[PDB]
Amino acid sequence: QFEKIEGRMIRILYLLVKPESMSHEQFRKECVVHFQMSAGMPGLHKYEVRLVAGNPTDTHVPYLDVGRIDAIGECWFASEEQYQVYMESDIRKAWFEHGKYFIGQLKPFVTEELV
Amino acid sequence: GRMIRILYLLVKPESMSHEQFRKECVVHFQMSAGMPGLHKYEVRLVAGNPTDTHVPYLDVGRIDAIGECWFASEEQYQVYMESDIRKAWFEHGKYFIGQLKPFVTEELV
Ligand SMILES: CC1=CC(=O)O[C@H]1CC(=O)O
Ligand SMILES: CC1=CC(=O)O[C@H]1CC(=O)O
């Protein structure tokens, strides 16, 4: 029941591309720092960041090319009020300063749960 | 170690309306229940595309839904790959998924 209610939270999914000049070695380290910085973030229920390890190109369905994505982030917010606490937070603002250093380009998707 | 996770960007067929596509996403989820080798499937619509990013905005075109598969181990992934009900589920995929991008992910934490 926890996992079910968690899954229907406000969720935003991010495609991350590293800065052109940053090494992959450094980008991975900065993703870990960015997760550590998320701990205790006002308003945030959960953050997850993962590397893109593979790009299987052999699809059954026509393949969609979106270029090289380096990591995938995701945030969960338990309510609109909590999302607002996060949006107003100085602590989030400092987290985003770290983001400007190790995220070259970003695509957010606000998702909608179907079930 | 950790579960194998594959994320998917889904674009609906041009022959299909946004509403027809939603309903097929729900069907695809229902079909996945008890899928050999699969730990979990999730599918979500893309409801918003904010551009107020601060870091440079990345344009990947219009993505209609996000799908994700979890497998508890490489042995379960292979059971899934061999399975005839997975193959039938993928035929449903060909019907409601116009274009697809998979990402195999790696945990960091
Ligand atoms: C919201 C976020 C998700 C993520 O991966 O990082 C932050 C965005 C940012 O730091 O600019
Ligand atoms: C694997 C999958 C993820 C997804 O959303 O659908 C299947 C692929 C498919 O049905 O072609």
Side-chain angles (χ1 to χ4, degrees), chain B residues 3-37:
Chain B
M3 294 223 175
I4 298 163
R5 292 166 70 182
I6 312 181
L7 197 120
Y8 300 83
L9 307 180
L10 280 65
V11 187
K12 80 182 168 57
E14 277 289 305
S15 61
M16 194 167 286
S17 67
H18 180 76
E19 187 49 22
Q20 292 172 329
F21 178 73
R22 175 182 80 67
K23 288 178 187 166
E24 296 305 319
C25 285
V26 179
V27 169
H28 208 59
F29 175 82
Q30 293 171 315
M31 289 172 166
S32 77
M35 178 59 61

Short mmCIF file of all heavy atoms in Angstrom, two decimals, chain B residues 3-37:
data_model
loop_
_atom_site.label_atom_id
_atom_site.label_comp_id
_atom_site.label_asym_id
_atom_site.label_seq_id
_atom_site.Cartn_x
_atom_site.Cartn_y
_atom_site.Cartn_z
N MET B 3 18.25 -4.83 -8.98
CA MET B 3 17.41 -5.23 -10.07
C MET B 3 17.88 -4.56 -11.36
O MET B 3 18.26 -3.37 -11.34
CB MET B 3 15.99 -4.81 -9.80
CG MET B 3 15.45 -5.58 -8.63
SD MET B 3 13.79 -6.09 -9.02
CE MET B 3 13.43 -7.12 -7.56
N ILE B 4 17.80 -5.29 -12.47
CA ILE B 4 17.95 -4.72 -13.82
C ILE B 4 16.73 -3.86 -14.12
O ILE B 4 15.59 -4.29 -13.86
CB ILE B 4 18.04 -5.83 -14.87
CG1 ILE B 4 19.27 -6.69 -14.61
CG2 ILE B 4 18.03 -5.30 -16.28
CD1 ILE B 4 19.23 -8.04 -15.33
N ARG B 5 16.97 -2.64 -14.59
CA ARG B 5 15.90 -1.69 -14.93
C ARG B 5 16.11 -1.14 -16.30
O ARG B 5 17.24 -0.75 -16.72
CB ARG B 5 15.79 -0.55 -13.90
CG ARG B 5 15.31 -1.10 -12.54
CD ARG B 5 15.53 -0.06 -11.42
NE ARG B 5 14.64 1.06 -11.57
CZ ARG B 5 14.64 2.10 -10.76
NH1 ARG B 5 15.52 2.16 -9.76
NH2 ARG B 5 13.79 3.06 -10.94
N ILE B 6 15.03 -1.13 -17.07
CA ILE B 6 15.06 -0.58 -18.42
C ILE B 6 13.94 0.45 -18.50
O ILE B 6 12.76 0.09 -18.23
CB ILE B 6 14.94 -1.64 -19.53
CG1 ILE B 6 15.88 -2.83 -19.29
CG2 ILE B 6 15.19 -1.00 -20.89
CD1 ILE B 6 15.81 -3.90 -20.39
N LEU B 7 14.30 1.68 -18.81
CA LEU B 7 13.34 2.75 -19.00
C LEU B 7 13.04 2.89 -20.48
O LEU B 7 13.89 2.68 -21.36
CB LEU B 7 13.89 4.07 -18.43
CG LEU B 7 12.76 5.10 -18.23
CD1 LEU B 7 12.54 5.61 -16.79
CD2 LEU B 7 12.94 6.19 -19.23
N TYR B 8 11.81 3.30 -20.78
CA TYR B 8 11.38 3.45 -22.19
C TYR B 8 10.67 4.78 -22.41
O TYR B 8 9.76 5.17 -21.64
CB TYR B 8 10.39 2.36 -22.65
CG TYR B 8 10.98 0.98 -22.55
CD1 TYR B 8 10.99 0.29 -21.35
CD2 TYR B 8 11.59 0.39 -23.65
CE1 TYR B 8 11.62 -0.97 -21.24
CE2 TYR B 8 12.15 -0.91 -23.55
CZ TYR B 8 12.15 -1.54 -22.37
OH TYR B 8 12.75 -2.80 -22.29
N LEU B 9 11.07 5.48 -23.46
CA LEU B 9 10.30 6.63 -23.98
C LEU B 9 9.38 6.16 -25.07
O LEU B 9 9.88 5.49 -26.00
CB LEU B 9 11.24 7.73 -24.50
CG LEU B 9 12.31 8.18 -23.52
CD1 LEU B 9 13.18 9.29 -24.19
CD2 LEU B 9 11.71 8.70 -22.20
N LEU B 10 8.09 6.38 -24.95
CA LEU B 10 7.08 5.89 -25.92
C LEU B 10 6.43 7.05 -26.65
O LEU B 10 6.00 8.02 -26.02
CB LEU B 10 5.94 5.16 -25.20
CG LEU B 10 6.11 3.72 -24.76
CD1 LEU B 10 7.19 3.69 -23.69
CD2 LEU B 10 4.79 3.11 -24.19
N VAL B 11 6.32 6.90 -27.97
CA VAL B 11 5.59 7.86 -28.84
C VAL B 11 4.47 7.06 -29.46
O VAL B 11 4.67 5.99 -30.02
CB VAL B 11 6.52 8.44 -29.92
CG1 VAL B 11 5.80 9.56 -30.72
CG2 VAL B 11 7.79 9.05 -29.30
N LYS B 12 3.23 7.57 -29.41
CA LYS B 12 2.10 6.88 -29.98
C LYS B 12 2.13 6.94 -31.53
O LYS B 12 2.82 7.82 -32.09
CB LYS B 12 0.76 7.45 -29.50
CG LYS B 12 0.37 8.70 -30.23
CD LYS B 12 -0.97 9.37 -29.73
CE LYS B 12 -1.09 10.74 -30.33
NZ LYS B 12 -1.03 10.66 -31.84
N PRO B 13 1.47 5.96 -32.15
CA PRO B 13 1.34 5.93 -33.63
C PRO B 13 0.57 7.14 -34.10
O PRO B 13 -0.35 7.59 -33.44
CB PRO B 13 0.52 4.66 -33.87
CG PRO B 13 0.77 3.82 -32.60
CD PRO B 13 0.73 4.83 -31.55
N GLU B 14 0.96 7.63 -35.29
CA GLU B 14 0.24 8.76 -35.91
C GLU B 14 -1.17 8.41 -36.29
O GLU B 14 -2.03 9.30 -36.42
CB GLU B 14 1.07 9.26 -37.09
CG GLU B 14 2.14 10.19 -36.65
CD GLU B 14 1.60 11.55 -36.20
OE1 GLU B 14 0.90 12.19 -36.95
OE2 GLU B 14 1.83 11.97 -35.05
N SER B 15 -1.50 7.14 -36.40
CA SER B 15 -2.86 6.73 -36.70
C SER B 15 -3.75 6.72 -35.47
O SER B 15 -4.93 6.41 -35.57
CB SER B 15 -2.82 5.35 -37.36
OG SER B 15 -2.26 4.41 -36.47
N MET B 16 -3.16 7.03 -34.30
CA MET B 16 -3.90 6.89 -33.05
C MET B 16 -4.08 8.24 -32.34
O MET B 16 -3.21 9.09 -32.34
CB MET B 16 -3.05 5.99 -32.15
CG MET B 16 -3.79 5.50 -31.01
SD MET B 16 -2.96 4.11 -30.09
CE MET B 16 -3.16 2.74 -31.14
N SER B 17 -5.26 8.42 -31.77
CA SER B 17 -5.48 9.62 -30.96
C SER B 17 -4.84 9.51 -29.60
O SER B 17 -4.49 8.40 -29.13
CB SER B 17 -6.97 9.87 -30.75
OG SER B 17 -7.48 8.83 -29.94
N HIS B 18 -4.63 10.63 -28.94
CA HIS B 18 -4.13 10.64 -27.56
C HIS B 18 -4.99 9.78 -26.66
O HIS B 18 -4.43 9.00 -25.83
CB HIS B 18 -4.16 12.05 -27.05
CG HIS B 18 -3.65 12.16 -25.65
ND1 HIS B 18 -2.30 12.09 -25.34
CD2 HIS B 18 -4.31 12.29 -24.48
CE1 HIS B 18 -2.17 12.17 -24.02
NE2 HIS B 18 -3.37 12.30 -23.48
N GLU B 19 -6.31 9.80 -26.83
CA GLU B 19 -7.22 8.97 -26.02
C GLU B 19 -7.11 7.49 -26.30
O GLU B 19 -7.20 6.65 -25.37
CB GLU B 19 -8.67 9.43 -26.17
CG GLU B 19 -9.66 8.70 -25.18
CD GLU B 19 -9.26 8.63 -23.67
OE1 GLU B 19 -8.46 9.40 -23.14
OE2 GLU B 19 -9.79 7.76 -22.97
N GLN B 20 -6.91 7.14 -27.56
CA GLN B 20 -6.78 5.73 -27.93
C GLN B 20 -5.50 5.20 -27.33
O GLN B 20 -5.42 4.04 -26.89
CB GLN B 20 -6.77 5.56 -29.45
CG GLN B 20 -8.14 5.90 -29.99
CD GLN B 20 -8.24 5.96 -31.48
OE1 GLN B 20 -7.29 6.32 -32.23
NE2 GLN B 20 -9.42 5.61 -31.95
N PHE B 21 -4.51 6.04 -27.32
CA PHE B 21 -3.19 5.66 -26.77
C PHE B 21 -3.25 5.48 -25.27
O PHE B 21 -2.71 4.49 -24.73
CB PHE B 21 -2.17 6.73 -27.15
CG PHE B 21 -0.78 6.48 -26.59
CD1 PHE B 21 0.02 5.46 -27.15
CD2 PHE B 21 -0.35 7.19 -25.51
CE1 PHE B 21 1.30 5.20 -26.62
CE2 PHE B 21 0.92 6.99 -25.00
CZ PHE B 21 1.73 5.99 -25.53
N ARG B 22 -3.93 6.35 -24.53
CA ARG B 22 -4.04 6.17 -23.08
C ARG B 22 -4.65 4.82 -22.80
O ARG B 22 -4.15 4.01 -21.99
CB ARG B 22 -5.01 7.23 -22.55
CG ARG B 22 -5.30 7.07 -21.08
CD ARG B 22 -6.34 8.15 -20.62
NE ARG B 22 -7.68 7.74 -20.96
CZ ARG B 22 -8.30 6.70 -20.42
NH1 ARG B 22 -7.67 5.92 -19.54
NH2 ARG B 22 -9.54 6.41 -20.77
N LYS B 23 -5.75 4.56 -23.46
CA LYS B 23 -6.50 3.31 -23.17
C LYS B 23 -5.58 2.16 -23.48
O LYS B 23 -5.59 1.18 -22.72
CB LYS B 23 -7.78 3.21 -24.02
CG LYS B 23 -8.82 4.20 -23.54
CD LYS B 23 -10.00 4.07 -24.47
CE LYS B 23 -11.04 5.15 -24.16
NZ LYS B 23 -11.97 5.16 -25.31
N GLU B 24 -4.77 2.21 -24.54
CA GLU B 24 -3.87 1.07 -24.84
C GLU B 24 -2.72 0.97 -23.82
O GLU B 24 -2.25 -0.17 -23.58
CB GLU B 24 -3.30 1.16 -26.23
CG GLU B 24 -4.38 1.06 -27.35
CD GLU B 24 -5.24 -0.16 -27.27
OE1 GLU B 24 -4.73 -1.26 -26.98
OE2 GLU B 24 -6.50 -0.06 -27.49
N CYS B 25 -2.29 2.06 -23.24
CA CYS B 25 -1.30 2.00 -22.17
C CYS B 25 -1.88 1.18 -21.02
O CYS B 25 -1.19 0.33 -20.43
CB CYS B 25 -0.92 3.39 -21.66
SG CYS B 25 0.13 4.35 -22.73
N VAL B 26 -3.15 1.42 -20.65
CA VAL B 26 -3.79 0.69 -19.54
C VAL B 26 -3.90 -0.77 -19.93
O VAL B 26 -3.56 -1.64 -19.09
CB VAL B 26 -5.18 1.27 -19.25
CG1 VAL B 26 -5.85 0.50 -18.11
CG2 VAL B 26 -5.06 2.67 -18.79
N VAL B 27 -4.27 -1.09 -21.15
CA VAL B 27 -4.34 -2.48 -21.59
C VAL B 27 -2.96 -3.11 -21.47
O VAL B 27 -2.82 -4.25 -20.96
CB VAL B 27 -4.87 -2.60 -23.04
CG1 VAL B 27 -4.70 -3.99 -23.61
CG2 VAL B 27 -6.38 -2.17 -23.11
N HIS B 28 -1.92 -2.40 -21.88
CA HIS B 28 -0.56 -2.97 -21.87
C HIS B 28 -0.16 -3.27 -20.43
O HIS B 28 0.52 -4.32 -20.17
CB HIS B 28 0.43 -2.03 -22.49
CG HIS B 28 1.59 -2.70 -23.10
ND1 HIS B 28 1.45 -3.63 -24.13
CD2 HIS B 28 2.91 -2.51 -22.91
CE1 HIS B 28 2.66 -3.98 -24.53
NE2 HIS B 28 3.56 -3.36 -23.78
N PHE B 29 -0.50 -2.38 -19.51
CA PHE B 29 -0.24 -2.65 -18.10
C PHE B 29 -0.99 -3.90 -17.61
O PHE B 29 -0.40 -4.79 -16.94
CB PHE B 29 -0.54 -1.46 -17.21
CG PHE B 29 -0.38 -1.79 -15.76
CD1 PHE B 29 0.87 -1.79 -15.14
CD2 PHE B 29 -1.49 -2.10 -15.01
CE1 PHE B 29 1.03 -2.15 -13.84
CE2 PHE B 29 -1.31 -2.39 -13.65
CZ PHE B 29 -0.04 -2.41 -13.08
N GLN B 30 -2.27 -3.99 -17.92
CA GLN B 30 -3.06 -5.16 -17.51
C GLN B 30 -2.46 -6.45 -18.08
O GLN B 30 -2.40 -7.46 -17.37
CB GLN B 30 -4.51 -4.97 -17.95
CG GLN B 30 -5.22 -3.85 -17.21
CD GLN B 30 -6.58 -3.57 -17.84
OE1 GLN B 30 -6.70 -3.49 -19.04
NE2 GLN B 30 -7.61 -3.47 -17.01
N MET B 31 -1.99 -6.44 -19.32
CA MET B 31 -1.44 -7.62 -19.95
C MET B 31 -0.20 -8.10 -19.22
O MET B 31 0.11 -9.30 -19.25
CB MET B 31 -1.09 -7.38 -21.36
CG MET B 31 -2.31 -7.22 -22.30
SD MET B 31 -1.73 -6.70 -23.95
CE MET B 31 -3.21 -7.01 -24.94
N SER B 32 0.57 -7.17 -18.65
CA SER B 32 1.86 -7.49 -18.03
C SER B 32 1.76 -8.27 -16.73
O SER B 32 2.79 -8.75 -16.23
CB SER B 32 2.66 -6.16 -17.78
OG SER B 32 2.18 -5.46 -16.67
N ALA B 33 0.59 -8.33 -16.10
CA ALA B 33 0.47 -8.97 -14.79
C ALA B 33 0.99 -10.41 -14.88
O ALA B 33 0.60 -11.17 -15.76
CB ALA B 33 -1.01 -8.99 -14.30
N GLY B 34 1.89 -10.76 -14.00
CA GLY B 34 2.34 -12.16 -13.94
C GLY B 34 3.16 -12.57 -15.12
O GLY B 34 3.29 -13.78 -15.38
N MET B 35 3.78 -11.62 -15.83
CA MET B 35 4.64 -11.85 -16.97
C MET B 35 5.91 -12.65 -16.56
O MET B 35 6.66 -12.21 -15.74
CB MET B 35 5.07 -10.48 -17.47
CG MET B 35 6.02 -10.55 -18.65
SD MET B 35 5.46 -11.38 -20.16
CE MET B 35 4.03 -10.39 -20.60
N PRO B 36 6.15 -13.83 -17.15
CA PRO B 36 7.36 -14.60 -16.76
C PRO B 36 8.61 -13.71 -16.75
O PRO B 36 8.85 -12.94 -17.69
CB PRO B 36 7.47 -15.69 -17.84
CG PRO B 36 5.96 -15.96 -18.20
CD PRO B 36 5.37 -14.56 -18.18
N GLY B 37 9.39 -13.89 -15.68
CA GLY B 37 10.67 -13.20 -15.58
C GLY B 37 10.59 -11.74 -15.21
O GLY B 37 11.61 -11.15 -14.84
#
